[PDB]
Scaffold this motif. Structure first.
Motif, PDB file in Angstrom:
ATOM      1  N   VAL A 123      34.943  30.208  40.656  1.00  0.00           N
ATOM      2  CA  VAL A 123      35.385  30.432  39.258  1.00  0.00           C
ATOM      3  C   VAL A 123      36.539  31.431  39.283  1.00  0.00           C
ATOM      4  O   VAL A 123      36.693  32.222  40.268  1.00  0.00           O
ATOM      5  CB  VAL A 123      34.213  30.910  38.379  1.00  0.00           C
ATOM      6  N   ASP A 124      37.294  31.419  38.197  1.00  0.00           N
ATOM      7  CA  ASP A 124      38.270  32.487  37.892  1.00  0.00           C
ATOM      8  C   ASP A 124      37.511  33.637  37.256  1.00  0.00           C
ATOM      9  O   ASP A 124      36.883  33.428  36.216  1.00  0.00           O
ATOM     10  CB  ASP A 124      39.399  31.958  37.002  1.00  0.00           C
ATOM     11  N   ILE A 125      37.540  34.807  37.872  1.00  0.00           N
ATOM     12  CA  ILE A 125      36.938  36.042  37.307  1.00  0.00           C
ATOM     13  C   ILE A 125      37.983  36.671  36.363  1.00  0.00           C
ATOM     14  O   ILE A 125      39.121  36.988  36.820  1.00  0.00           O
ATOM     15  CB  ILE A 125      36.477  36.988  38.432  1.00  0.00           C
ATOM     16  N   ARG A 126      37.642  36.776  35.073  1.00  0.00           N
ATOM     17  CA  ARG A 126      38.422  37.530  34.056  1.00  0.00           C
ATOM     18  C   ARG A 126      37.576  38.743  33.705  1.00  0.00           C
ATOM     19  O   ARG A 126      36.624  38.639  32.933  1.00  0.00           O
ATOM     20  CB  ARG A 126      38.763  36.622  32.870  1.00  0.00           C
ATOM     21  N   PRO A 127      37.829  39.900  34.334  1.00  0.00           N
ATOM     22  CA  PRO A 127      36.964  41.064  34.176  1.00  0.00           C
ATOM     23  C   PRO A 127      36.859  41.570  32.733  1.00  0.00           C
ATOM     24  O   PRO A 127      35.859  42.199  32.413  1.00  0.00           O
ATOM     25  CB  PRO A 127      37.613  42.153  35.027  1.00  0.00           C
ATOM     26  N   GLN A 128      37.844  41.242  31.878  1.00  0.00           N
ATOM     27  CA  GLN A 128      37.739  41.514  30.414  1.00  0.00           C
ATOM     28  C   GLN A 128      36.548  40.744  29.813  1.00  0.00           C
ATOM     29  O   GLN A 128      35.939  41.276  28.893  1.00  0.00           O
ATOM     30  CB  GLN A 128      39.058  41.200  29.687  1.00  0.00           C
TER      31      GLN A 128
END
Ligand SMILES: NS(=O)(=O)c1cc(C(=O)NCCCO)c(Sc2ccccc2)cc1Cl
Ligand SMILES: NS(=O)(=O)c1cc(C(=O)NCCCO)c(Sc2ccccc2)cc1Cl
Ligand SMILES: [Zn+2]
Ligand SMILES: [Zn+2]
Lengths: 251, 251
Positions: free
Chosen positions: A24-29
Motif C-alpha cells: 500500500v501507499d502509506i499516507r502518514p496524515q
C-alpha cells in the motif's frame, strides 16, 4: 507467475483479486495513532556462525531461510517465529520498494516473514487473521558499506543463476533491520506475491536501513530471473487501502 | 469442572494457567483510543419467530443456540458467524459480571460467541488468534422491565433442572445489546471456562443494558447446577492483563 507480465495473478490465485491487498501507499496524515502499539521484541536473532543458512536466488527474489528459535512479538500475547527474509528492488536509477510513503518509492525493501506460534506451518496460517506477520524496512543510500548486508551481497555473484543457492554463516539477523523498533506503521494486508492470501499483519519501520551505492548496485545488477531476464523491478504495484486504516505507533 | 469447587481448572485444562486469560478489570482511563476501531456490523440478527431456538441449562449457564446467517465484522475482512449466547450472574445482594470496570462488578453479563469465517470448524479456531470473538455487555438494574431479556428470563422455570432444555421462538438477538455499536473496549484473551483456550477477541460494550430488579432476581434464583446446588456466581475471578493494553473505539 512472474513480475511485469502473464499469467494475470488472479488466474494463478483468486486471493490476488482480494479487496485487502499489500503493498500500500502509506499516507502518514491518514495514519491512526494507536498507543497500544508497543516496541517490537526480537529474541534469538543473534546467530552463531554454524550451522550455516541457505541463501537462494528463487527467480523472484534472493531469500535467506532462517533456522528454528527466532521469536518475534508484535506485543503481549502476539507471538511469531521467523521463517525467512527476502528483498524487493529496482534497477539502475529506478527505486523498487513495495511500500511507498506519499507516493515516494525507496531504492529497496527487506521483508522478514513470520508464522504465528498457534500454527505449525504456513499452509495452515494462509488466509487466517494474524496467521503471518511481516517486518518491512526500506533500504536507502548511505555513505558507509553496511557490514551485515555485505555478508549476503558479497555472495550474490555465486547465486547469479535463477534457482541457484549457497550456504552463508549465521549472523545477527536483527542488524539487517533498523535499530528503532518503536516507530512503525501497522496494517492488515496480504502476501505481495501469489497466492496473495489476506490476514497478514504488516509492520513497516519509520527508520530506514543504509546501504552504500555500490551495495544497492550489487543487489539490482547481479541476479538473473525467469529466462534470460535480469532479476530487477521485483515489486508489486501499490494496492488500494479500500477503507483500511493504517495505524502508527507514534503521533 | 464447576464454579468455585473442584476439580482445579488447570488440571481440567492447563491452558487456564496461561498468561493471557479472560476476564480482566477494564480501566477506561488506561484504554488506548484507536480510530481504526470502527462501529460493530451485525447483520441477520433480527430472527423470525420460526424456526424456534434451543435454550439449555448446562449446569454452568443458560445457553441459547443460534442459527446460521448471523454475520458480524470487527473490521475490514475480519468477519464472524454467531454460534450461541449465554449469561454470567451473581446471587442475592451479590453481582456476577465476569469483566469488571475500575474494580466494579456489574449484576450480570451476556456473551455472544462467534467463529471466524476464516475457520471451517470451531476445533481449528480454538487457540488460534482471532479464531473466536465474543461480544460482551453488562446487565444493570433499571426501573423498567426489559422486553428482549423477558423472552429468555420467562423460560428459565421450565429448565431449572441441570441438563434440562426447551425450545423458544426466534427473537431479535441484536435487541439484547446496548444502544451504541461505535463505543466499546477490545482486547485479546481466552475462554472464561475450561478449556480456557487463548486467541479470543473480546469486545465489551461501553454502555450497559438495563433489567428490572425482578428480572435479575429471576436470572440468579431459578436455575440449579452442580448436583443439588443453585446455579449462582457462575463467573471466573479477575485475570491480570500481563502487559495487554485494552483498546477503546472512542477518545
Ligand atoms: N512479499 S511478502 O508479502 O513478504 C511474502 C513473500 C513470500 C515469498 O517468498 N514470495 C516469493 C518471493 C520471495 O522469496 C512469502 S512465502 C512464499 C509464498 C509463495 C511462494 C514461495 C514462498 C510470504 C510473504 Cl508474506
Ligand atoms: N464465557 S466465554 O468465554 O464467552 C465462553 C463460554 C463458553 C461456554 O459455553 N461454556 C460456559 C457456559 C456456557 O453456557 C463457550 S462454549 C464454546 C464455543 C466454541 C468453542 C469452544 C467452546 C465459549 C466461550 Cl468464548
Ligand atoms: Zn516480500
Ligand atoms: Zn461467557
Amino acid at each position: 507467475w512472474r513480475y511485469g507480465g502473464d499469467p494475470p495473478w488472479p488466474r494463478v490465485s483468486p486471493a490476488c483479486a482480494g479487496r485487502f491487498q499489500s503493498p500500500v501507499d502509506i499516507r502518514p496524515q491518514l495514519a491512526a495513532f494507536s498507543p497500544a502499539l508497543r516496541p517490537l521484541e526480537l529474541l534469538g536473532f543473534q546467530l552463531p556462525p554454524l550451522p550455516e543458512l541457505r541463501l537462494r536466488n528463487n527467480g523472484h527474489s534472493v531469500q535467506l531461510t532462517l533456522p528454528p528459535g527466532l521469536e518475534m512479538a508484535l506485543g503481549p500475547g502476539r507471538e511469531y517465529r521467523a521463517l525467512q527474509l527476502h528483498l524487493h528492488w529496482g534497477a539502475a536509477g529506478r527505486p523498487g520498494s513495495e511500500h511507498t510513503v506519499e507516493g515516494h518509492r525507496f531504492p529497496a525493501e527487506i521483508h522478514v516473514v513470520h508464522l504465528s506460534t498457534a500454527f505449525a506451518r504456513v499452509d495452515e496460517a494462509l488466509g487466517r487473521p494474524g496467521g503471518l506477520a511481516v517486518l518491512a524496512a526500506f533500504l536507502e543510500e548511505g555513505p558507509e558499506e553496511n557490514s551485515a548486508y555485505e555478508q549476503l551481497l558479497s555472495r550474490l555473484e555465486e547465486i547469479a543463476e535463477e534457482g541457484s543457492e549457497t550456504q552463508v554463516p549465521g549472523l545477527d539477523i536483527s542488524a539487517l533491520l533498523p535499530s528503532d523498533f518503536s516507530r512503525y506503521f501497522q496494517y492488515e494486508g496480504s502476501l505481495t506475491t501469489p497466492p496473495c492470501a489476506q490476514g497478514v499483519i504488516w509492520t513497516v519501520f519509520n527508520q530506514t536501513v543504509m546501504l552504500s551505492a555500490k551495495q544497492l548496485h550489487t543487489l539490482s545488477d547481479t541476479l538473473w530471473g525467469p529466462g534470460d531476464s535480469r532479476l530487477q523491478l521485483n515489486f508489486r504495484a501499490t494496492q488500494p487501502l479500500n477503507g483500511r486504516v493504517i495505524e502508527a505507533s507514534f503521533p
